[PDB]
Design an enzyme around this catalytic site. Structure first.
Site, PDB file in Angstrom:
ATOM      1  N   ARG A 158       0.799  -1.218   0.000  1.00  0.00           N
ATOM      2  CA  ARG A 158       0.000   0.000   0.000  1.00  0.00           C
ATOM      3  C   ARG A 158       0.856   1.306   0.000  1.00  0.00           C
ATOM      4  NH1 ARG A 158      -3.854   2.768   4.255  1.00  0.00           N
ATOM      5  NH2 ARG A 158      -5.323   3.778   2.813  1.00  0.00           N
ATOM      6  N   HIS A 167       0.682   4.301  -2.698  1.00  0.00           N
ATOM      7  CA  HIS A 167       0.507   5.710  -2.338  1.00  0.00           C
ATOM      8  C   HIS A 167       1.721   6.549  -2.713  1.00  0.00           C
ATOM      9  CE1 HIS A 167      -3.084   5.595   0.652  1.00  0.00           C
ATOM     10  NE2 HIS A 167      -3.331   4.944  -0.467  1.00  0.00           N
ATOM     11  N   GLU A 214       3.185  14.247   3.325  1.00  0.00           N
ATOM     12  CA  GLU A 214       2.043  13.627   2.686  1.00  0.00           C
ATOM     13  C   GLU A 214       1.357  12.687   3.691  1.00  0.00           C
ATOM     14  OE1 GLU A 214       3.070  11.634  -0.947  1.00  0.00           O
ATOM     15  OE2 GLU A 214       4.268  13.284  -1.681  1.00  0.00           O
ATOM     16  N   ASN A 231      -4.002   9.091   3.738  1.00  0.00           N
ATOM     17  CA  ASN A 231      -2.854   8.586   4.506  1.00  0.00           C
ATOM     18  C   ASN A 231      -3.025   8.707   6.011  1.00  0.00           C
ATOM     19  OD1 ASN A 231      -1.084   7.679   2.519  1.00  0.00           O
ATOM     20  ND2 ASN A 231      -0.399   9.764   2.049  1.00  0.00           N
ATOM     21  N   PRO A 275      -7.284   7.878  -4.692  1.00  0.00           N
ATOM     22  CA  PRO A 275      -8.715   7.539  -4.799  1.00  0.00           C
ATOM     23  C   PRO A 275      -9.322   7.212  -3.432  1.00  0.00           C
ATOM     24  CG  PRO A 275      -7.432   5.689  -5.508  1.00  0.00           C
ATOM     25  CD  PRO A 275      -6.460   6.837  -5.337  1.00  0.00           C
ATOM     26  N   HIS A 280      -6.167  -5.928  -2.928  1.00  0.00           N
ATOM     27  CA  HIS A 280      -7.096  -6.141  -1.820  1.00  0.00           C
ATOM     28  C   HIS A 280      -7.293  -7.624  -1.525  1.00  0.00           C
ATOM     29  CE1 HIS A 280      -8.726  -1.813  -2.198  1.00  0.00           C
ATOM     30  NE2 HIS A 280      -7.624  -1.923  -1.530  1.00  0.00           N
ATOM     31  N   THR A 314      -9.144 -15.879   1.746  1.00  0.00           N
ATOM     32  CA  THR A 314      -7.754 -16.022   2.206  1.00  0.00           C
ATOM     33  C   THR A 314      -7.264 -14.616   2.553  1.00  0.00           C
ATOM     34  OG1 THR A 314      -7.053 -15.978  -0.122  1.00  0.00           O
ATOM     35  CG2 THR A 314      -7.305 -18.055   0.870  1.00  0.00           C
TER      36      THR A 314
END
Ligand code: HEM
Ligand code: HEM
Ligand code: HEM
Ligand code: HEM
Ligand SMILES: [Ca+2]
Ligand SMILES: [Ca+2]
Ligand SMILES: [Ca+2]
Ligand SMILES: [Ca+2]
Ligand SMILES: [Ca+2]
Ligand SMILES: [Ca+2]
Ligand SMILES: [Ca+2]
Ligand SMILES: [Ca+2]
Ligand SMILES: [Ca+2]
Ligand SMILES: [Ca+2]
Ligand SMILES: [Ca+2]
Ligand SMILES: [Ca+2]
Lengths: 306, 306, 306, 306, 306, 306
Positions: F38, F42, F64, F70, F139, F170, F225
């Site tokens: 992730r 970002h 940031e 974040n 997003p 994801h 999973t």
């Protein structure tokens, strides 16, 4: 009498062969390591680790696969046949099915991320299966703590650490809904759920095992790390998240005086648990083995050599 | 060929039945456990453990009960008949008298506080009794060490540990004065007592076995714990307190080079002795057994099935 | 499971006896301490520290003395026999050869001026020697760093400190010319000497190992203090003066990222090195030991007790 | 991503050009086909088949030609330059050196009588050479089987068939005496020759590589058909006639459990071997290739395009 | 390996609990701080600080409380039991008896007015007591300086500062008349008092320990400040007022070359002494400790956990 | 311009170091691999993969880490610092934080069981952080499909496969309840739950995120999973079990014409998904990188080199 170096000159590659077989199965059945550990446990508790559980029906004896704790539950048999054929090919007539299953259980633990050790070897295979003895010796999920303790003592595992450490086998693997229903809806005819089951988890379990669903649906023993062999099993117990009654009782029973400390101890240190597990495992692996010239070294695990 | 799990499916309760019978006798005859261990020993040394010693006279053969080491000495027979009737009632025609006596000897040891183990099983009963062979094979209290050693070797018990461990059966039980007189008064025509008999103990023994008393009066084999199966027997040997000549020689004979260390070793560790005893016992239990279809499974231990 | 106080009640003088024996040998063979440390290392890397390396040939198994890293290299065996006879005389049947060799290795280090500590004890002796396993497990001087690392990991010594600390055993002792020739004249078929070998030292080595001399001639591992156990071994590595390839690679390999810091660290502080050495030694001493009733306590280190 | 038809519209004649070049060289250097197959192998094992091995020294990077397994051993470079000029002339800037070497290796096999297939294409050329990586990745003749296996696994060739099939490249080609001396005279310091080397062949080899001869003299890898690509390589292994240690170990190592069957299998059927070889070759040709716009299409194989 | 912050997250209040317990005892037994410091010293000199001195007799081992330097002299045991129960109540199963006694000794010094520091922690408890070792390792009041020095060196306290600093423990506490009689009346068969005992003090001591009085009567080690931990102990030595022979010898022995300066130095600066004491104490606290998983954490200091 | 072999000569061990660090963290934080993937995402979406997200506040620019996507969500920063220190130690000043985070994201995927590939390298670190740009470019879970598509297109990821493949991130990881509440109770002011959320799952989610519970409680992105990187994420979407709105829309939006086929395609073949993921990842890794002499190679990832 049992020594870890038993095959070192006769069949130096056994463990490699066993390990490769399991790694291979894991790609198609991620549950295989857990199942195998369970077979060894069910083997050892019925007349020792003599591979008696692997025999199929004959006209002289009934298979233990029909025992109450095995029927529609035990699994992994074809994988054992596969590793046996592979080792027969490498070291004809040398490794018994009893030893093979022991090595396999140990490899399954390590491969799921648990400790690594060399199990004592040199066991031999039984000449018959003992169904009645299996019905009498295997513990059930609804036993109270004094009953679990009695069950372990009966086979010689007389320390509280034996019961607590070995119950850590529930750190991975699956369990059928049928075994937790009496807990989610009507526990012991109280008309209410088991008071020792965390209520948030209760809701989740009910979602997984609806009052009129499939009793054979599977839920994970360990909600934290379902497939990793680690000590999370104990952390869940302290939060009232042990899945089956026999799990939670180690921490919640009024008789859990001697077990609560071990549970807490294993929950605090992965190392302490691993050492304990390993010792408990080797004690279980030493239950009344067939050695020397007793029993035989089967060519195929399902039948007695004729 | 012999396996400890032989009756596990056919007559799972045998040991319980044997144990209950002995516990029961113990209330009236505290000497029963010792006597039974001795019967098994006398059984095994004459053509193996085949229950030949249990047969009564017939017109075709003389009973071993008349052998020199059995006559007016061996006892416990009615108790064996009692346990046999009890097991016939539970598992008709399944447990042989040879196995029964083996289980009984093992249970007698544990009940007197000794180790606990599962004896190999599956022996069958002989078709005749061997009196002459009994006269030739049973050792006597006046044998020298090389003679005792020869006696054990003759039946296949060729290790010094066999002789030393098995002699520990003298850790309980009784002995008649007649067998120690030559030692208390005129040892080997020297006109003097045995120089290897501690002098303080000599006085006590003389009080128990007066020069003109009853030769059938009984004295305990072990002065420390007369009725407990433990290693005290060896501690007595180091202090020159072995009761009969064959006992003391294991420690005092000029030929006791290989035995003295074992004696000392068993005197220092109850565990070392127990392990040794158990192994020696299983070796004795394996002397030329009748298995498979040889011999029979007697309905009553005293007679051949007709 | 292993404890440093194992013999404190049973044979309180073992270390004294071991130490006296070594001090005595040192007068005639100043190389003995180094050789002994090396035997222990070769013992532990093949099925753990079980004294398997001490067994001589039998018809059932080949001696590890013929393994590639042992043949015409390993030495010190008669000295071990001497200390074993001395301790058998003081504490009959109590100290195993596995423990003896461990105590001896530790005493050799201290006597050469290294740290002093009490090694964990209670190991037992193996029933066979493992030649093939020795051929597979012992590292060779020509291994690259990833290979050395693989070799140590294979037996469970998975930390870089294990490899770096234990390589400090090269702070004393000798090495044959044959093992450094490929470096002095034609390194890896380049037709040139090893670029990581200091050129001044290169000249000296060539004087000691002439292109057509005796390949069995000996040179010291440590040019600074050939016979003193200290950290100079690391100082030499920083100056490109490690004698054998596996020594220099810990500092000069492109893969030596994790080892260079330890090397520098050990070169700067004798204390840091000593602590590290001691811990690494105790980890090596703990490789799959035989404890409890496994294995035996040999009467003579070269043969299995019959 | 790689496809065998990559140049079919852009440069339809590449294979013809490559083949003609090799056929032509074969008239003057009968060893060329073997050498070329070896270059491809050495290319692919160091960062994939990217032609990195073909680059000459620059001030920014050292050439892999100086790597331990390449120095004074690798050959055939000018022949690659010749085929590159020929294809640049026919299809300017279209075929990369990585693809060229792959096609060449495949053509060399077929021309020596091996199978015929179309290799996947579309690889691109690297921007630098990786000497250190070459020193770390290329296997050596003295590796044990677990080491060879580790070496192949490291680059992604994780099947036993990969190692066994690809080792069949030794069915033709030459080898220097220097690589077999330790085997003919003093194997692993045993002071004796390698026990796995057939003794009749041992004598022949000694005649070819005398103890004080030229270490650069060449002997054939395959004594049956030195120049024909066929399965004889495996037949020799079964008779203990593998030339270098890494060859014989596939059949004689105690760890050769999984390889012995493949060896036997390839020795029995030329077709089985050919299919296996082809698949293994295509797996090796797929190691981390540079495709799409990565890397470049060199004008000359020895230098990066500026 | 031992760190002062060992319990900071697991049992942050240990020192408070230990301190409160001692402050409390001090109200009834003003001698308690001195006694406790002495127990730690006697613990550490026999197999390290492992709480072995706290174990009571068992059938497997004799208690060190019967050692020559402990019998009818060592005291304070019930106070240790009290602090152990208090800490078990706060941090169940976490603080070992070895650590507890170390913290207690340090707190006793500070509470008597000495320096304050945090002792390294993480020691574990022994599995047996070592009576013979205690008889061999504890120094006696009649030792000469070279003997005291030998005694300290034997356990690893090899610096003169170790002996001189640690002897400062005699700055408080009591001593029995029996230990100074040979000095007041007939020193070393000379028929005269010890010439190194100041004559004015000699008279006082004789008043306290009359030739036919109670040998168990107590006199203070430090005549200046009997109960305060300070450097007066050294001032007395310079005036020939050390109470026991081993005290005076540090200043009066012909071999006291290396000790006299330290004595003078400690007598001149309370700070120099305190720093020295603290360092010596931490060196003594580091003698062969049991760490990691060796030994155990006792529930009760007098018995091994079963 | 970016090449996968960028560090092969300069710092050949980077990936090993990165991998070891992650494996190590995984033992204490099983969520680390997901978090790291992730961070890279970002990083790349705000001015390219330039490590701008790793900078902490300065007086010249805002971090940031305070951006809407974040704040109280992004995690893993200290682990990046740890791997950076480790690589600075091995290859001082050579690997940029931008490259490090890219390698780390790739290693996290493989370690969680995903594909394995070599990422293009050679990026450099930014001189400032871009908070406003982060607020505009990242997003949010409540975006509609045309909005998600717009968001990806904006940074150059203009293919539907980019959005569909990358959303597969994801397949592991956690999500806070706060992000799914509007869906479980009042979706888009309809006063009803999101109609595209399977109703059985709806109940489970409500149990995990009760209407008045902790909004920061975590639920797994993938119910099949939770911790394994595989294609199950897509199987859930077909059953209406995507956890957050942006997940489900790829399959349920009226505008999902071009995405539904990819979803189905990825759900049917693990291989197809893996290839797609890898390509999408390399396209994301190529967003406006700083190369050559632009930007710098930070000594510490949190601050600009001064
Ligand atoms: C080594 C040679 C042996 C000799 C010479 C010997 C001799 C004897 C004698 C003379 C008696 C007393 C007989 C009587 O007073 O009526 C006796 C009793 C006994 N012996 Fe031994 N024995 C030997 C070995 C053994 C062995 C190997 C065992 C069993 C493992 C054994 C177990 C017993 C027991 C338990 C008794 C007491 C029996 C009772 O109280 O009824 N003996 N033995
Ligand atoms: C890391 C890999 C190692 C390699 C490749 C290696 C290699 C060698 C070699 C080739 C020799 C000389 C043999 C001869 O000339 O006959 C030797 C001697 C020696 N090695 Fe090592 N060694 C290693 C690790 C160790 C370890 C871990 C220890 C012990 C803690 C050790 C202790 C010694 C000693 C003390 C000697 C000299 C023995 C004597 O003089 O008899 N070595 N080693
Ligand atoms: C499995 C490990 C391998 C090792 C240890 C190894 C070792 C060697 C050695 C030492 C030589 C001779 C070098 C010389 O004398 O200069 C050689 C030559 C050769 N090798 Fe291998 N090799 C291996 C695998 C392979 C593979 C996989 C291939 C190709 C598919 C291959 C193909 C060849 C050929 C054809 C030659 C002869 C080259 C010539 O004549 O120029 N080798 N190899
Ligand atoms: C398509 C639009 C995307 C949206 C709206 C989105 C949204 C989110 C949200 C809201 C969370 C949970 C935040 C929290 O609870 O604190 C999250 C976690 C995560 N996302 Fe996404 N995401 C998107 C795309 C991606 C992409 C392209 C990747 C990477 C290839 C990715 C990888 C992850 C991972 C692995 C986690 C779990 C992180 C952890 O457990 O620490 N996401 N995402
Ligand atoms: Ca069984
Ligand atoms: Ca788990
Ligand atoms: Ca008989
Ligand atoms: Ca007794
Ligand atoms: Ca060994
Ligand atoms: Ca040195
Ligand atoms: Ca390459
Ligand atoms: Ca050929
Ligand atoms: Ca102590
Ligand atoms: Ca004072
Ligand atoms: Ca960025
Ligand atoms: Ca998943």
């Amino acid at each position: 009498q049992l020594t870890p170096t038993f095959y070192d000159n006769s069949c130096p590659n056994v463990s490699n062969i066993v390990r490769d077989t399991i790694v291979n199965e894991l790609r198609s059945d991620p549950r295989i390591a857990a199942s195998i550990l369970r077979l060894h446990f069910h083997d050892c508790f019925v007349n020792g680790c003599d591979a008696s559980i692997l025999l199929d029906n004959t006209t002289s004896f009934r298979t233990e696969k029909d025992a109450f704790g095995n029927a529609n539950s035990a699994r992994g048999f074809p994988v054992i046949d596969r590793m046996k054929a592979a080792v027969e090919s490498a070291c004809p007539r040398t490794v018994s099915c009893a030893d093979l299953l022991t090595i396999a259980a140990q490899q399954s633990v390590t491969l799921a991320g648990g400790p690594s050790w060399r199990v004592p070897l040199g066991r031999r295979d039984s000449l018959q299966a003992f169904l009645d003895l299996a019905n009498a010796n295997l513990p059930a999920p609804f036993f109270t703590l004094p009953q679990l303790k009695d069950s372990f003592r009966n086979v010689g595992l007389n320390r509280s650490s034996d019961l607590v450490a070995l119950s850590g086998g529930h750190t991975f693997g699956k369990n059928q809904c049928r075994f937790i229903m009496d807990r989610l809806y009507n526990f012991s005819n109280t008309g209410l759920p088991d008071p020792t089951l965390n209520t948030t988890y209760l809701q989740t379990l009910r979602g997984l095992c609806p009052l009129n669903g499939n009793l054979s649906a599977l839920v994970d023993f360990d909600l934290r790390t379902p497939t990793i062999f680690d000590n999370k099993y104990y952390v869940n117990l302290e939060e009232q998240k042990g899945l089956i009654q026999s799990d939670q009782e180690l921490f919640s029973s009024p008789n859990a005086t001697d077990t609560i400390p071990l549970v807490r101890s294993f929950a605090n240190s992965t190392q302490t648990f691993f050492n304990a597990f390993v010792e408990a495992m080797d004690r279980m692996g030493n239950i009344t083995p067939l050695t020397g010239t007793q029993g035989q070294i089967r060519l195929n695990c399902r039948v007695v050599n004729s």
